[PDB]
Write an enzyme that holds these catalytic residues in place. Structure first.
Site, PDB file in Angstrom:
ATOM      1  N   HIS C 194       0.834  -1.202   0.000  1.00 44.15           N
ATOM      2  CA  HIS C 194       0.000   0.000   0.000  1.00 44.15           C
ATOM      3  C   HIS C 194       0.859   1.239   0.000  1.00 44.15           C
ATOM      4  CE1 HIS C 194      -3.215   2.720   0.599  1.00 44.15           C
ATOM      5  NE2 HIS C 194      -3.020   2.919   1.891  1.00 44.15           N
ATOM      6  N   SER C 198      -0.909  -0.883  -6.098  1.00 39.08           N
ATOM      7  CA  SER C 198      -0.807  -2.037  -6.984  1.00 39.08           C
ATOM      8  C   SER C 198      -0.361  -1.645  -8.378  1.00 39.08           C
ATOM      9  CB  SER C 198      -2.144  -2.763  -7.051  1.00 39.08           C
ATOM     10  OG  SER C 198      -2.546  -3.198  -5.769  1.00 39.08           O
ATOM     11  N   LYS C 220     -15.834  -7.371  -7.605  1.00 39.72           N
ATOM     12  CA  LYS C 220     -15.000  -8.217  -8.460  1.00 39.72           C
ATOM     13  C   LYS C 220     -14.335  -9.333  -7.661  1.00 39.72           C
ATOM     14  CE  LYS C 220     -12.121  -7.448 -12.538  1.00 39.72           C
ATOM     15  NZ  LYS C 220     -11.446  -6.406 -13.356  1.00 39.72           N
ATOM     16  N   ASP C 221     -13.867  -9.022  -6.450  1.00 39.84           N
ATOM     17  CA  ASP C 221     -13.298 -10.037  -5.578  1.00 39.84           C
ATOM     18  C   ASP C 221     -14.363 -11.003  -5.088  1.00 39.84           C
ATOM     19  OD1 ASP C 221     -10.895  -8.783  -5.972  1.00 39.84           O
ATOM     20  OD2 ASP C 221     -10.435  -8.523  -3.845  1.00 39.84           O
ATOM     21  N   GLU C 264       3.624 -34.575  -3.822  1.00 43.75           N
ATOM     22  CA  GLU C 264       2.367 -34.113  -4.394  1.00 43.75           C
ATOM     23  C   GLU C 264       2.606 -33.214  -5.608  1.00 43.75           C
ATOM     24  OE1 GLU C 264      -0.367 -33.502  -1.367  1.00 43.75           O
ATOM     25  OE2 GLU C 264      -2.026 -32.833  -2.638  1.00 43.75           O
TER      26      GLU C 264
HETATM   27  C1  HEM Z   1       0.969 -16.305   1.336  1.00 47.29           C
HETATM   28  C2  HEM Z   1       0.689 -16.181   0.045  1.00 47.29           C
HETATM   29  C3  HEM Z   1       0.315 -14.870  -0.506  1.00 47.29           C
HETATM   30  C4  HEM Z   1      -0.795 -14.137  -0.232  1.00 47.29           C
HETATM   31  C5  HEM Z   1      -1.906 -14.517   0.713  1.00 47.29           C
HETATM   32  C6  HEM Z   1      -0.709 -12.949  -1.000  1.00 47.29           C
HETATM   33  C7  HEM Z   1      -1.706 -11.975  -0.934  1.00 47.29           C
HETATM   34  C8  HEM Z   1      -1.630 -10.820  -1.675  1.00 47.29           C
HETATM   35  C9  HEM Z   1      -2.625  -9.836  -1.714  1.00 47.29           C
HETATM   36  C10 HEM Z   1      -3.927  -9.877  -0.961  1.00 47.29           C
HETATM   37  C11 HEM Z   1      -2.177  -8.860  -2.542  1.00 47.29           C
HETATM   38  C12 HEM Z   1      -2.909  -7.609  -2.901  1.00 47.29           C
HETATM   39  C13 HEM Z   1      -3.805  -7.980  -4.077  1.00 47.29           C
HETATM   40  C14 HEM Z   1      -3.074  -7.935  -5.392  1.00 47.29           C
HETATM   41  O1  HEM Z   1      -2.027  -7.273  -5.540  1.00 47.29           O
HETATM   42  O2  HEM Z   1      -3.553  -8.537  -6.374  1.00 47.29           O
HETATM   43  C15 HEM Z   1      -0.921  -9.235  -3.041  1.00 47.29           C
HETATM   44  C16 HEM Z   1      -0.169  -8.472  -3.903  1.00 47.29           C
HETATM   45  C17 HEM Z   1       1.021  -8.931  -4.429  1.00 47.29           C
HETATM   46  N1  HEM Z   1       1.641 -10.085  -4.184  1.00 47.29           N
HETATM   47 FE1  HEM Z   1       1.021 -11.431  -3.052  1.00 47.29          FE
HETATM   48  N2  HEM Z   1       0.418 -12.949  -1.725  1.00 47.29           N
HETATM   49  C18 HEM Z   1       1.095 -14.082  -1.477  1.00 47.29           C
HETATM   50  C19 HEM Z   1       2.307 -14.544  -1.983  1.00 47.29           C
HETATM   51  C20 HEM Z   1       3.020 -13.839  -2.932  1.00 47.29           C
HETATM   52  C21 HEM Z   1       4.206 -14.280  -3.539  1.00 47.29           C
HETATM   53  C22 HEM Z   1       4.903 -15.591  -3.294  1.00 47.29           C
HETATM   54  C23 HEM Z   1       4.602 -13.292  -4.411  1.00 47.29           C
HETATM   55  C24 HEM Z   1       5.790 -13.289  -5.279  1.00 47.29           C
HETATM   56  C25 HEM Z   1       5.908 -14.152  -6.277  1.00 47.29           C
HETATM   57  C26 HEM Z   1       3.648 -12.246  -4.323  1.00 47.29           C
HETATM   58  C27 HEM Z   1       3.726 -11.090  -5.038  1.00 47.29           C
HETATM   59  C28 HEM Z   1       2.753 -10.107  -4.929  1.00 47.29           C
HETATM   60  C29 HEM Z   1       2.867  -8.876  -5.698  1.00 47.29           C
HETATM   61  C30 HEM Z   1       3.985  -8.533  -6.642  1.00 47.29           C
HETATM   62  C31 HEM Z   1       1.801  -8.136  -5.381  1.00 47.29           C
HETATM   63  C32 HEM Z   1       1.469  -6.780  -5.938  1.00 47.29           C
HETATM   64  C33 HEM Z   1       0.857  -7.057  -7.310  1.00 47.29           C
HETATM   65  C34 HEM Z   1       0.096  -5.870  -7.829  1.00 47.29           C
HETATM   66  O3  HEM Z   1      -0.854  -5.409  -7.169  1.00 47.29           O
HETATM   67  O4  HEM Z   1       0.405  -5.359  -8.928  1.00 47.29           O
HETATM   68  N3  HEM Z   1       2.718 -12.587  -3.386  1.00 47.29           N
HETATM   69  N4  HEM Z   1      -0.581 -10.430  -2.470  1.00 47.29           N
END
Ligand code: HEM
Ligand SMILES: CCCCCCCCCCCCCCCCCC(=O)OC[C@H](COP(=O)(O)OCCN)OC(=O)CCCCCCCCCCCCCCCCC
Ligand code: HEC
Ligand code: HEC
Ligand code: HEM
Ligand code: HEM
Ligand SMILES: COc1c(O)c(C)c(C/C=C(\C)CC/C=C(\C)CC/C=C(/C)CC/C=C(\C)CC/C=C(\C)CCC=C(C)C)c(O)c1OC
Ligand SMILES: COc1c(O)c(C)c(C/C=C(\C)CC/C=C(\C)CC/C=C(/C)CC/C=C(\C)CC/C=C(\C)CCC=C(C)C)c(O)c1OC
Lengths: 236, 76, 373, 97, 164, 43, 38, 78, 64, 184
Positions: C194, C198, C220-221, C264
């Site tokens: 934040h 995004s 949408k979500d 798995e």
């Molecule tokens: C525990 C697992 C994960 C959860 C629950 C999680 C959850 C979220 C949530 C809720 C957002 C905001 C919504 C969104 O940006 O679409 C987000 C953004 C993001 N997450 Fe994750 N995430 C996880 C793992 C990861 C991993 C492993 C990566 C890297 C490969 C990652 C990279 C990102 C990025 C780059 C954003 C920003 C994307 C954007 O808004 O343009 N996340 N994540």
């Protein structure tokens, strides 16, 4: 060898298990398979189904006296069973089975179908796939050639033959009929909820078919505003 | 927060009421033709790799199959 | 109101890009899933014991007697599978659209993945089947690869000479905590994001076009949650064993093993990589790098454009990367014999060469084509 | 090679959304500085184009092909400025070491 | 300054000493439960096998395999090239009785149970990653770096093999 | 005064003195306490 | 990295080296008392 | 219920840092065996738990030898 | 009479199974064809088996 | 840094009154006690079994066979007692110094107090001693007092006609899960 496909009725998407057969397969297990195999996790209560209601199960529940009850010291086998009585076991100890199975182990068959890759088919195939050993076959101890069996040395003694037993329903007890019927029961026990679930799944498909276009319509209402927004650049 | 984001100037932004615009513009009718356009544009760059893969999988399976396949002549 | 201000600040009046596609749903789905996995795990923990004595049994009881147990247990298993599907698509979105330039979010991210992977092994080992037992020994032995302190570490984790009750009970806690752990790490994720907002699929500065989140990306979500629930319930109520291995229903044979042992699907390729490197240690390291190469990803960005929407050569390389990731997932399944091995060896070589070498060189070439370099 | 450039241009298709090249440069600090210096007219124009793209992307639509910024039409406005900013950072760096 | 800081340094060591102690017991808790690591016993009879019979004994949660070797098996295993072996350990080197071979069933690779009567070289095999062990339990093929483990059988008399 | 200027003024050295001291202090503490316990309980 | 290539930059590091070793050294000895490796 | 309260006695372990007299624990373990073992068993206690100068391990194993019931001499023969 | 036997027989009669059987027959004959050879035929046996079995399931369960 | 800003905002650069006495320590102690309880509780959960045949046996196995398991168990019990000592002194500080005029803080406090009392009650039921079983029946019976829906509620919680294994296992689940809600 990759077991081919088989048209199991219950396997139908929205269709369910045929308890009649299930019943018949429980008979088959009780009269043949229980001498080396036991539905430990299955109880007469679990056994309940259209195949056998608690009442019928009670009969079977009272039909056994093996390890259903203990004695002054709870040893050996000392008393018959009732509804809560779990399925009797051919062996009070693993060694017992091992002893009475070429040293090998006749596995309890409660989750057997789930356990075996392509179980329902495997089971049917194994019980009815001994086939013929063309060559290089040296069955060591109480083994039975069966290409369906991984080693063709099953050792699961072929316990079913034409009229191996007699179905109480009277349906001809052909090896296959017997095999298929018990299969159903085994499957039924492995997933006592197969029927229960498929009804949920049908209600889930109807509810999602109702709810997905309506939620899509809301989303497209609240997103129409933007999706119609017209931008114009008007430098002074 | 909203406000104090970007110095955007002279960008009139007309809009229409949700209940005033047709509730659900045809998606299949209007949108999917463009979707088809959209997908066809990229697929031309998306499936090629997978095109290759399927081939690999297929060849591999049969190959491994033949590998297991024993020749009567072998040790004959 | 100081509690409602944060909720407003992160979910209602948050300025979001207007043009983000459905992919951007997936992370929210992950949060919903985690919740699901956890809540399901609770009931799974209920009526369950960490005793090799009663672990496999009460679970069968859950499958047979526990009120709606069969439903909660298979929801937990297929929700772990849905978690890894949404995780892989979330990571693929981050790789494709250049979202790794949010470096702190990505690192909380890469760590998050390792964690989720572990929770899988955790949940996996817990039912005490034939496959769980032989799978645990295998990966625990992976640790023994360590050059000097390996043996000790393995024995420590096992809590004894070989995995036995000592392991089951402790693995139970990690599998009760790592979920809570990962959950928090995710919270860190949301904060570190934040601060920057995004990204959008064009990869440009979307400050001129941002909309609220409550009425636009909430419904949408909600729609994405409904579709994910449709896929999860058609996975649970119709094909409850298409992703598992039947071996599970076999009480662990402390003595015997499954002729065919496979990790798995979600990790299948991971092990595929191991199988490829001849050296045990090499395999372990490469395996780790397989996941870690991602963390390394924000330092490999050599392009002047953030996203791959306007970058066709790197798009081709990205889809070749997805292709041989699917190939490595298939190979892991295949047994050890020709020619599965060679493919595995190449596929691993191609995977590391595309991520390490081919994409920055392609980005340099793409910058040269636009008269930028 | 130039023909290939035009092909890549079409393939990049940033032209489709109606954006010039300088439009897509990731806003790295350096890029940020140059953008700021842009004469206001261009800056406001840049914003319009960028925003339009966003809107178009949202609707999963592309402008009329004709409206696509032709490769030839595409001009580099930010770059002239960017060069200076980069040189500036460079100058500071060595006076730094 | 040295008086005030020495107090800070003194205190630190003290805290540091307590902190290592607290953390140490905790860490130690998850160490081997004393009750289970109080189990090092064993009882085996060498007269339980006619010939070529592998006999594990689930010792300490580990397969106490005790395969038997017919002279034929004995004959080939000796024929095996020790130097050419992945792990140089002649069949007899791991057995004091050629007719009697005893091994631990943990694949040097990732720890599965190496099923016997399998493996190209004969003897053992591990369905996990395809390691083939000869009757001697030597890794002849597979991702198994070391040979199968030989327990301290220390057979006292043909009647009884201690196999600690 | 020398000590301050030598091992207690530079934070890095401050840590060094702390760690090293702790390394020795413990064994001793354990010994002393253990010994005392023993003297206190003669059997 | 290009920027890191600097003579002064080098001087700074050289001046910084001893301190770096110290903290690592303390950490090293610390690990010892931390585990009592066996 | 009116129960004459136990008249607190002066135990060698009554003090704040006062440990147990291990010869007395050894003698009391003998007491249990010969007398109360008839009608009381230290189930949660095991001969391994008898590790203490009160009784050393090898001799304790002899005690372990003394007891011989329900070990499961026969698993199939139960 | 086990319908299994009958159906098996029937399927075998199917020209497809007939040809599959042809293979098996030729191959089982081959099993006995040579001794020092390793013409186990398990492969060809399995070949026919599966083919015929598919046919069996294709028309057995209904009788069942 | 958006994670370090909250930590700075709540623990480093937070403007605190200069003259608060030692009583203002107690709430921080409660937080520490919570963490201590959670940590000790986690190390009780790696060996405890929530089965009525084996719960007392598992507790004795913790005290007798797990290395320093008696230490972690009695630290958990006396840390629950220390938690309630610090809780009572925290509430007494709030009553004496007029801190209840922070009304939202006070109401979240009394919710925390109810949650901590429920957690300690079910935790005391958990070792399945003589006193735990009769204590549980007693308070569960308290619910039966409800004018109309009492009987049902009691039976629901018990999960059966009378507290038995059904209760123990759900009390283990609830006693596990409530301290994280207490932390939130
Ligand atoms: C525990 C697992 C994960 C959860 C629950 C999680 C959850 C979220 C949530 C809720 C957002 C905001 C919504 C969104 O940006 O679409 C987000 C953004 C993001 N997450 Fe994750 N995430 C996880 C793992 C990861 C991993 C492993 C990566 C890297 C490969 C990652 C990279 C990102 C990025 C780059 C954003 C920003 C994307 C954007 O808004 O343009 N996340 N994540
Ligand atoms: C213990 C008594 C300690 C003591 O010396 O009390 C005197 C103190 C005087 O308070 P004051 O005049 O404001 O001066 C404080 C600065 N010297 O007064 C105080 O110390 C005030 C202490 C406030 C907290 C007292 C908590 C007592 C326990 C309450 C438990 C029950 C709470 C409600 C439960 C329902
Ligand atoms: C009178 C003896 C006997 C009867 C009757 C018998 N079995 Fe078995 N079965 C065995 C023995 C002995 C083994 C152990 C073989 C081994 O472990 O190698 C066995 C093992 C099995 C296995 C394990 C094979 C595998 O894939 O791992 C299956 C499945 C099986 N039996 C199915 C059945 C079914 C289905 C029936 C009847 C519908 C049946 N058995 C009746 C003796 C019997
Ligand atoms: C004759 C067999 C026997 C002997 C030997 C024996 N006890 Fe007992 N003990 C019993 C019985 C029976 C009870 C329970 C009596 C009752 O509850 O009314 C009991 C109860 C007890 C109790 C429990 C009292 C209570 O309030 O519940 C204690 C303490 C006790 N004995 C101590 C000992 C000690 C110490 C010894 C060794 C000197 C010993 N006993 C030897 C048979 C024996
Ligand atoms: C804190 C929350 C969680 C708890 C209490 C929990 C508890 C449990 C329990 C008791 C089981 C054994 C019952 C069973 O066999 O299904 C289990 C299995 C499992 N859990 Fe979890 N879990 C939690 C979160 C998770 C998460 C987040 C994942 C995904 C990473 C996960 C993945 C699994 C898997 C894969 C299994 C094996 C399922 C199977 O038998 O096929 N769990 N969980
Ligand atoms: C989530 C963290 C916690 C876990 C996992 C946990 C787990 C357990 C377990 C397994 C026991 C049974 C072992 C025993 O008999 O001591 C137990 C007992 C107990 N717990 Fe907890 N607990 C937690 C937090 C707490 C908290 C916060 C309190 C205080 C309100 C508490 C109070 C108790 C009490 C009073 C007992 C009974 C101790 C006794 O036998 O005398 N627990 N807990
Ligand atoms: C760009 O706009 C946003 C956005 O601003 C936020 C906060 C989230 C985060 C939303 C969530 C619902 C968080 C994930 C859900 C959970 C339940 C988290 C689970 C973890 C816990 C510790 C509970 C998004 O997914 C998102 O994109 C759609
Ligand atoms: C000046 O006012 C404050 C204050 O603002 C804060 C944040 C704390 C918090 C202090 C801590 C040491 C944090 C630990 C305290 C907790 C209550 C931890 C809470 C976390 C969970 C329960 C999880 C105080 O103790 C305090 O009074 C002195």
């Amino acid at each position: 060898l990759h077991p081919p496909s088989y048209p199991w009725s219950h396997r139908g998407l929205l269709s369910s298990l045929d308890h009649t057969s299930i019943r018949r397969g429980f008979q088959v297990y009780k009269q043949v398979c229980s001498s080396c195999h036991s539905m430990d996790y299955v109880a007469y209560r679990h056994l309940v189904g259209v195949c056998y209601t608690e009442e019928e199960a009670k009969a079977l529940a009272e039909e056994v006296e093996v390890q259903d009850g203990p004695n002054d010291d709870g040893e050996m086998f000392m008393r018959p069973g009732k509804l809560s009585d779990y399925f009797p076991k051919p062996y009070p100890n693993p060694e017992a089975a091992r002893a009475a199975n070429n040293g090998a182990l006749p596995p309890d068959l409660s989750y057997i179908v789930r356990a075996r890759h392509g179980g329902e088919d495997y089971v049917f195939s194994l019980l009815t796939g001994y086939c013929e050993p063309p060559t290089g076959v040296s069955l060591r101890e109480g083994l039975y050639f069966n290409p369906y069996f991984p080693g063709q040395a099953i050792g699961m003694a072929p316990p079913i033959y034409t009229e191996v037993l007699e179905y109480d329903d009277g349906t001809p007890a052909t090896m296959s009929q017997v095999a298929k019927d018990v299969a159903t029961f085994l499957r039924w026990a492995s997933e006592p909820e197969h029927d229960h679930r498929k009804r949920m799944g049908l209600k889930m498909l109807l509810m999602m078919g109702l709810l997905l276009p309506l939620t899509y319509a809301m989303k497209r209402h609240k997103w129409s505003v933007l999706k119609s927004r017209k931008l114009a650049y008007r430098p002074p | 927060e909203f406000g104090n984001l970007a110095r955007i100037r002279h960008v009139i932004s007309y809009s229409l009421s949700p209940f005033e615009q047709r509730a659900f513009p045809s998606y299949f009718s209007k949108g999917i033709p463009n979707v088809l356009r959209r997908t066809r544009e990229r697929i031309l760059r998306v499936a090629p790799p997978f095109v290759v893969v399927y081939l690999i999988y297929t060849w591999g399976n049969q190959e491994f199959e033949q590998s297991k396949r024993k020749n009567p002549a072998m040790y004959e | 109101h100081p509690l409602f201000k944060i909720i407003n600040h992160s979910f209602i009046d948050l300025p979001a890009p207007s043009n983000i596609s459905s992919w951007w749903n997936f992370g929210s789905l992950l949060g919903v899933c985690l919740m699901v996995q956890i809540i399901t795990g609770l009931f799974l923990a209920m009526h369950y014991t960490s005793d090799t004595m009663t672990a496999f049994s009460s679970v069968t009881h859950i499958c047979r007697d526990v009120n709606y147990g069969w439903l909660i247990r298979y929801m937990h298993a297929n929700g772990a599978s849905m978690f890894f599907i949404c995780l892989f698509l979330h990571v693929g979105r981050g790789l494709y659209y250049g979202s790794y330039t949010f470096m702190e979010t990505w690192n909380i991210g890469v760590l998050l993945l390792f964690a989720v992977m572990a929770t899988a092994f955790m949940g996996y080992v817990l039912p005490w089947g034939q496959m769980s037992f032989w799978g645990a020994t295998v990966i625990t032995n992976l640790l023994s690869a360590i050059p000097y302190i390996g043996t000790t570490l393995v024995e420590w984790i096992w809590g004894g000479f070989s995995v036995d009750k000592a392991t089951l009970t402790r693995f139970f806690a990690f599998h009760f905590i790592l979920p809570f752990i990962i959950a928090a790490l995710a919270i860190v994720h949301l904060l570190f994001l934040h601060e920057t907002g995004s990204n959008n699929p064009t990869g440009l500065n979307s400050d001129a076009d941002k909309i609220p989140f409550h009425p636009y990306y909430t419904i949408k979500d909600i729609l994405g949650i409904l579709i994910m629930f449709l896929i999860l319930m058609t996975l649970v109520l119709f094909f409850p064993d298409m992703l598992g291995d039947p071996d599970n229903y076999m009480p662990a044979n402390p003595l015997n093993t499954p002729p065919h042992i496979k990790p798995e699907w979600y990790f299948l390729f991971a092990y595929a990589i191991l199988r490829s490197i001849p050296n045990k240690l090499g395999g372990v390291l490469a395996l780790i790098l397989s996941i870690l190469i991602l963390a390394l990803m924000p330092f490999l960005h050599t392009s002047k454009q953030r996203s791959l929407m306007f970058r066709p050569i790197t798009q081709i390389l990205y889809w070749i990367l997805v292709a041989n990731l699917l190939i490595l997932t298939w190979i892991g399944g295949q047994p050890v014999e020709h020619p599965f091995i060679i493919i595995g060896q190449l596929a691993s070589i191609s995977y590391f060469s595309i991520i390490l070498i081919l994409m920055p060189i392609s980005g340099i070439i793409e910058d040269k084509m636009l008269k930028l370099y | 090679l130039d023909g290939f450039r035009k092909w890549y241009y079409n393939a990049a298709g940033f032209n489709k959304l109606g954006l010039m090249r300088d439009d897509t440069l990731h806003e790295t600090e350096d890029v940020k500085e140059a953008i700021r210096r842009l004469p206001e007219d261009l800056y406001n124009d840049r914003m319009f184009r960028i925003k339009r793209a966003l809107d178009l992307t949202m609707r999963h639509q592309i402008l009329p092909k004709d409206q696509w910024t032709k490769y030839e039409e595409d001009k580099f406005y930010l770059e002239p400025y960017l060069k200076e900013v980069i040189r500036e950072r460079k100058e500071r760096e060595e006076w730094a070491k | 300054k040295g008086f005030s800081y020495l107090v800070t340094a003194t205190t630190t060591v003290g805290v540091a000493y307590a902190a290592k102690n607290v953390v140490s017991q905790f860490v130690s808790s998850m160490s081997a439960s004393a009750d289970v690591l109080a189990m090092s016993k064993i009882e085996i009879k060498l007269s339980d096998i006619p010939e070529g019979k592998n006999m594990a004994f689930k010792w300490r949660g580990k397969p106490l395999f005790v395969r038997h070797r017919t002279k034929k098996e004995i004959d080939q295993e000796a024929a095996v090239e020790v130097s050419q072996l992945r792990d140089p350990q002649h069949d007899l080197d791991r057995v004091k009785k050629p007719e009697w071979v005893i091994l631990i069933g943990v694949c040097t690779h990732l720890g599965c149970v190496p099923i016997a009567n399998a493996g190209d070289f004969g003897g053992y095999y591990c369905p996990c990653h395809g390691s083939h062990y000869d009757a001697s339990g030597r890794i002849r093929k597979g991702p198994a770096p070391l040979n199968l483990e030989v327990p301290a059988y220390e057979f006292t008399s043909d009647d009884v093999v201690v196999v600690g | 005064s020398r000590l301050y200027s030598l091992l207690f003024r530079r934070t890095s050295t401050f840590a060094l003195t702390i760690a090293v001291g702790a390394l020795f202090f413990e064994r001793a503490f354990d010994q002393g306490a253990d010994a005392i316990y023993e003297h206190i309980n003669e059997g | 990295l290009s920027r890191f290539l600097g003579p002064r930059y080098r001087e700074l590091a050289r001046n910084w080296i001893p301190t770096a070793g110290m903290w690592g050294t303390v950490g090293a000895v610390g690990l010892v008392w931390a585990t009592d490796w066996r | 219920d009116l129960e004459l309260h136990p008249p607190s006695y002066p135990w060698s372990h009554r003090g704040l840092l006062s440990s147990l007299d291990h010869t007395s624990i050894r003698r009391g373990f003998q007491v249990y065996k010969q007398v109360c073992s008839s009608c009381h068993s230290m189930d949660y206690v095991a001969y391994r738990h008898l590790v203490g100068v009160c009784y050393t391990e090898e001799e304790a194993k002899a005690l372990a030898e003394e007891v011989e019931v329900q070990d499961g001499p026969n698993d199939d023969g139960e | 009479v086990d319908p299994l036997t009958t159906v098996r027989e029937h399927c075998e009669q199917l020209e497809k199974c007939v040809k599959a059987r042809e293979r098996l027959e030729l191959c089982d004959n081959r099993v006995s064809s040579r001794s020092q050879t390793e013409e186990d035929c398990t492969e060809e046996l399995f070949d026919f088996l599966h083919a015929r079995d598919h046919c069996v399931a294709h028309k057995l369960f209904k009788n069942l």
